[PDB]
């Protein structure tokens, strides 16, 4: 029955009554910061339970982008602004390497303003008008943290490395084709059940690097909210579905070649 605040990026809000299976209202914010000046975009609405509090900030030569998202689950808890949060001050803030595909920088350095923030490497390739960046490096806290996770199939490659050590996110830009043949083979598909993930539209892909599990995942995508399957190669990918903007999701992994056959469920 829960109610939230819906605010399209322009500032025009209204009270939203949440559709069932949506136990959290949330505030999404991007603060683009460049030379003194600053734009801020604020978006609010109800959201699905699996959603968590998260932050990601990266440096794009003279510019710093800060994405943040906060979720709560009480009437209009999505309204707040100047009651203030937790003001930090460390002697030695964690420093990470930082860059983005935007100015093809992926590099510079970044001081993480909070202690729960870690160093990030987010690879997002060929998946979902607007478009996520290919490579992103910086500070923040996201699902997979800590550790690292990955997935890849015929259409996509997703990788998140989250780590606490100094400048630990450094190293060469990670492209899929530079991962060595994992030796395992798993199936690959997307889209609707009998329409995109049929027994005869999925084929064996040769997995790469740390992606040796064979997954299948089901849930709800877009344009509306239809059922949606995914098959591919993975690591420790589970709750990590926004890397497909899939919700009400239930993943699965098995460690045997071809084990994720549609016939084998």
């Amino acid at each position: 029955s829960l109610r939230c605040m819906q605010c399209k990026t322009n500032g025009d809000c209204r009270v939203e009554e949440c559709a069932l299976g949506q136990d959290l209202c949330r505030t999404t914010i991007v603060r683009l910061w460049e030379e003194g000046e600053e734009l801020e975009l604020v978006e609010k609405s109800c959201t699905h339970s699996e959603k968590t509090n998260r932050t990601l900030s990266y440096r794009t030569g003279l510019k710093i982008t800060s994405l943040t998202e906060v979720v709560c689950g009480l009437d209009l808890c999505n309204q707040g602004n100047s009651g203030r949060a937790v003001t930090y001050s460390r002697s030695r803030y964690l420093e990470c390497i930082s860059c983005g595909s935007s100015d093809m920088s992926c590099h510079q350095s970044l001081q993480c303003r909070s202690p729960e923030e870690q160093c990030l490497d987010v690879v997002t390739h060929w998946i979902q008008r607007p478009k996520d960046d290919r490579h992103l490096r910086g500070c923040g806290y996201l699902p997979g943290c800590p550790g690292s996770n990955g997935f890849h199939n015929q259409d996509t490659f997703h990788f998140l490395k989250c780590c606490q050590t100094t400048k630990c996110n450094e190293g060469p830009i990670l492209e899929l084709e530079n991962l060595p043949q994992n030796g395992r083979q798993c199936y690959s598909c997307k889209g609707q059940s009998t329409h995109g993930c049929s027994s005869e539209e999925t084929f064996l892909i040769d997995c790469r690097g740390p992606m040796n599990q064979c997954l299948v995942a089901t849930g709800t995508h877009e344009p509306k909210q239809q059922s949606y399957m995914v098959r591919g190669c993975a690591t420790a990918s589970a709750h990590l579905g926004d890397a497909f903007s899939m919700n009400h999701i239930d993943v699965s992994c098995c460690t045997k070649s071809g084990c994720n056959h549609p016939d084998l469920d």
């Binding site: 990026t9 322009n10 949330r26 999404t28 914010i29 991007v30 683009l32 460049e34 000046e37 734009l39 975009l41 978006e43 609405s45 959201t47 998260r54 990601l56 994405l67 943040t68 998202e69 935007s102 100015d103 987010v122 997002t124 998946i127 979902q128 008008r129 607007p130 478009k131 996520d132 960046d133 996201l142 699902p143 926004d242 890397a243 497909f244 903007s245």
Partner: protein
């Protein structure tokens, strides 16, 4: 997305819907509408998108999203805002095709039209 002047639209999977714009080195604003380098207007200024924001008297302009400007005929919440160059700022514009770029100014208790100081590139 509407990111002008060669800007490109970006989003992030870990952050719901939010999309914004990546603008080329010398263009600012949410949609890159702001010509961050122009220092004068061509013609009558109808297509001027610079950052001038002070009138003939040296007074600052009211922002195109001021509660006050929102009561005028030209303000930031118009369906065509973006096309007129009226946004969350106070930069001189000329949405009605007057002789030179202007903006509303708080003159006493009145939001009056005032021509800015920038001149013709001529």
């Amino acid at each position: 997305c509407d990111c002008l002047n060669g800007g490109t639209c970006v989003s992030n999977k870990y952050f719901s819907n939010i999309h914004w714009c990546n603008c080329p080195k010398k263009f600012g604003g949410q949609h890159c509408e702001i010509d961050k380098s122009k220092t004068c207007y061509e013609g009558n200024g109808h297509f001027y998108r610079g950052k001038a924001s002070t009138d003939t008297m040296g007074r600052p302009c009211l922002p195109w999203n001021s509660a006050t400007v929102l009561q005028q005929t030209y303000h930031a919440h118009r369906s065509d805002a973006l096309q007129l160059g009226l946004g969350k700022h106070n930069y001189c514009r000329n949405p009605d095709n007057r002789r030179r770029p202007w903006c509303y100014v708080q003159v006493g208790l009145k939001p009056l039209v005032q021509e800015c100081m920038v001149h013709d590139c001529a």
